[PDB]
């Protein structure tokens, strides 16, 4: 076992799991889900004594809410069995335990509803509504909604009740930023886009509205059920180990077409 | 943000 030395002792035997997922979405103008997947990693940070037999249990459905892995690679320390149990003697400190992909039953934490109105050929009226879709006790953090503007843009007027927004002319986008937002809510932004005149013939190819966010759950639906520690020499049971998990779900590509 | 595994 060349990934863990043999001397290791801690009074405080503790581990931390980070489930880190990036959720990706392409949505049609009329709310259809054109494409969506999650990529995830589980990172373990183990401060455990001796050489212990860890067993990682999740809400895998092949084994309540239960979920569907398309595929995954593991860290060499993992004993490949097909009971679908995850067994290993972990390296010390921090390492990547598994990497995975999911396409089915994904929680899309945000819904984006765009509305666009042409006003002659002098301006565009734009309304965008975002809906948080997740437990109300949970807050999303670091929410950005990026609304692209045409190249013939004289100037931009925006109102929003939540957040701050700026027209960023060099980037050709309005950028709305919200610090915090809770589950099962709505917010909207209105903007009026002043146009320059332009070659009437070439039309605007409206790129998507994209979002960034971070959420404290796994959009795949993954929940950690247990992490079991057995060290058969040393005199500490499983229930002596202090165990922690956190979830950090972040947008990848998360685009809604208008 | 870290919670106990129950």
Curated annotation (Swiss-Prot), chain A:
Gene Ontology CC annotations of this record: AP-2 adaptor complex; clathrin-coated pit; cytoplasmic vesicle; extrinsic component of presynaptic endocytic zone membrane; glutamatergic synapse; plasma membrane; postsynapse; synapse
Subcellular localization(s) per the UniProt record: Cell membrane; Membrane, Coated pit
Gene Ontology molecular functions: clathrin adaptor activity; disordered domain specific binding; lipid binding; low-density lipoprotein particle receptor binding; signal sequence binding; transmembrane transporter binding
GO biological process: clathrin-dependent endocytosis; intracellular protein transport; negative regulation of protein localization to plasma membrane; positive regulation of receptor internalization; positive regulation of synaptic vesicle endocytosis; postsynaptic neurotransmitter receptor internalization; protein-containing complex assembly; receptor internalization
Binding annotation for a 1,2-diacyl-sn-glycero-3-phospho-(1D-myo-inositol-3,4,5-trisphosphate): 164, 168, 177
Tissue: Detected in brain.
Keyword vocabulary terms for this entry: Cell membrane, Coated pit, Endocytosis, Lipid-binding, Membrane, Phosphoprotein, Protein transport, Transport
Membrane topology: Peripheral membrane protein
Disulphide linkage map: none
Functional description taken from the UniProt entry: Component of the adaptor protein complex 2 (AP-2). Adaptor protein complexes function in protein transport via transport vesicles in different membrane traffic pathways. Adaptor protein complexes are vesicle coat components and appear to be involved in cargo selection and vesicle formation. AP-2 is involved in clathrin-dependent endocytosis in which cargo proteins are incorporated into vesicles surrounded by clathrin (clathrin-coated vesicles, CCVs) which are destined for fusion with the early endosome.
Similarity section: Belongs to the adaptor complexes medium subunit family.
Assembly and oligomerization: Adaptor protein complex 2 (AP-2) is a heterotetramer composed of two large adaptins (alpha-type subunit AP2A1 or AP2A2 and beta-type subunit AP2B1), a medium adaptin (mu-type subunit AP2M1) and a small adaptin (sigma-type subunit AP2S1). Interacts with ATP6V1H and MEGF10. Interacts with EGFR and TTGN1. Interacts with F2R. Interacts with PIP5K1C; tyrosine phosphorylation of PIP5K1C weakens the interaction. Interacts with KIAA0319; required for clathrin-mediated endocytosis of KIAA0319. Interacts with DVL2 (via DEP domain).
Name by which UniProt lists this protein: AP-2 complex subunit mu
Origin species: Rattus norvegicus (Rat)
First-to-last residue of the parent protein present: 159 to 435 of 435
């Amino acid at each position: 076992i060349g990934w863990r030395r043999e001397g290791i002792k801690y009074r405080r035997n503790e581990l931390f799991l980070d489930v880190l997922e990036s959720v990706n979405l392409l949505m049609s103008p009329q709310g259809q889900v054109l494409s969506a997947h999650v990529s995830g990693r589980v990172v373990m940070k183990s401060y455990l004594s001796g050489m212990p037999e860890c067993k990682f249990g999740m809400n895998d459905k092949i084994v309540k809410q239960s979920i569907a892995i398309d595929d995954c690679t593991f860290h060499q320390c993992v004993r490949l069995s097909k009971e679908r149990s995850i067994s290993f003697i972990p390296p010390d400190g921090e390492f990547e335990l598994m990497r995975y992909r999911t396409t089915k039953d994904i929680i899309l934490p945000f819904r984006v509803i765009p509305l666009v109105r042409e006003v002659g050929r002098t301006k565009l009226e734009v309304k965008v509504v975002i809906k948080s879709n997740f437990k109300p006790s949970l807050l999303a953090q670091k929410i950005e909604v990026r609304i692209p503007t045409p190249l013939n843009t004289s100037g931009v007027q925006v109102i929003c009740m939540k957040g701050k927004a700026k027209y960023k002319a060099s980037e050709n986008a309005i950028v709305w930023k919200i610090k915090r937002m809770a589950g099962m809510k709505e917010s909207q932004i209105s903007a009026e886009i002043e146009l320059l005149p332009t070659n009437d013939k070439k039309k605007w190819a409206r790129p998507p509205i994209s979002m960034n966010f971070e959420v404290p759950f796994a959009p795949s639906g993954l929940k950690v059920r247990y992490l079991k520690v057995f060290e058969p020499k040393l005199n500490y049971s499983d229930h002596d180990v202090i165990k922690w998990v956190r979830y950090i779900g972040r947008s990848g590509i998360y685009e809604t077409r208008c | 943000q870290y919670k106990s595994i129950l």
